[PDB]
From a paper:
In the compact “short” state (∼66 Å height), the flipping helices fold back to interact with the inner helices; in the extended “long” state (∼100 Å height), they extend to form interactions with each other.
The interaction energy between the flipping helix and the inner helices in the short state was tuned by combining hydrogen bond layers (“A”) or hydrophobic layers (“X”) in different orders in each of three possible positions. Designs were given three-letter names corresponding to the layers in order, starting at the hinge proximal position. In the long state but not in the short state, the “key” hinge residue (G75) and the “backup” hinge residue (T76) have the potential to form an ion coordination site. We sought to design calcium- or nickel-binding sites in the long state by introducing aspartic acid or histidine at the key hinge residue position. Crystal structures were determined for all potential bistable candidates (XAX_GGDQ, XXA_GVDQ, XAA_GGHN, and XAA_GVDQ), and we chose to focus on XAA_GVDQ because of the presence of a bound calcium.
Residue numbers in the entry:
A (entry chain A), C (entry chain C): 2 to 93
B (entry chain B): 3 to 93
The structure:
């Protein structure tokens, strides 16, 4: 969506640029500037979506640290049970 | 950056209006200057994103480690069920 | 690579702008516009790589969810083992 719109907006701008070099004009210079502005508006919208989406990076990190915490808990529990078993089997 | 980014383009949209209203060599050049300054902010925003994206790779590494540990715990648990089952059957 | 190219491209554009304000001319205005287009084309390529790269955020999330699922499976097993042992040691 954004990138399809982005590269189309740039190809439209590349067309204006060619006409401009073919046929320089105040009207075409201004029209080229307008197209640049509209393209920059799409670049800003694209960056905005990336930033919004980047919030998932933070929540992935938080869940990883929780997972590591739980894994560390399990490890301590597992070391107890090995001691219990060996002790208790050595028992009998 | 985002607030600065969208403000920078709003400023740019104003110049564009004046440009189409009263074209002028001065205003064309001033519009070009504003575009450059806007592009300089776009590049800075992309730079912060790339820097920030390094966290994606470290999240992946930690995930892989977590999966390794979980697989380790798994093999331990299946042996433990064996000893318990066998020990209870012992008696 | 991308961002190294990005800041060079804007450095090139900043110098054109300097010459433009020093010696305005149709040729230099058009040349400035061309440089802007080429810079925008690089901005778009950089965003494209970021979006491609951001797919890793989704795969990290899926793997975390799996890891959490497994941890919850282990947790229930451990509580079963906890009771087996205690009752089996109280047993005798
Ligand atoms: Cl991530």
């Amino acid at each position: 969506s954004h990138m399809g719109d982005l590269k189309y907006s740039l190809e439209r701008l590349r067309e204006i640029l060619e006409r401009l070099e073919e046929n320089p004009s105040e009207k075409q210079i201004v029209e080229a500037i307008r197209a640049i502005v509209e393209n920059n508006a799409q670049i800003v919208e694209a960056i905005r979506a990336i930033v919004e989406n980047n919030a998932q990076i933070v929540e992935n990190n938080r869940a990883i640290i929780e997972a590591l915490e739980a894994i560390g808990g399990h490890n301590k529990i597992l070391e107890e049970m090995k001691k219990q078993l060996k002790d208790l089997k050595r028992s009998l």
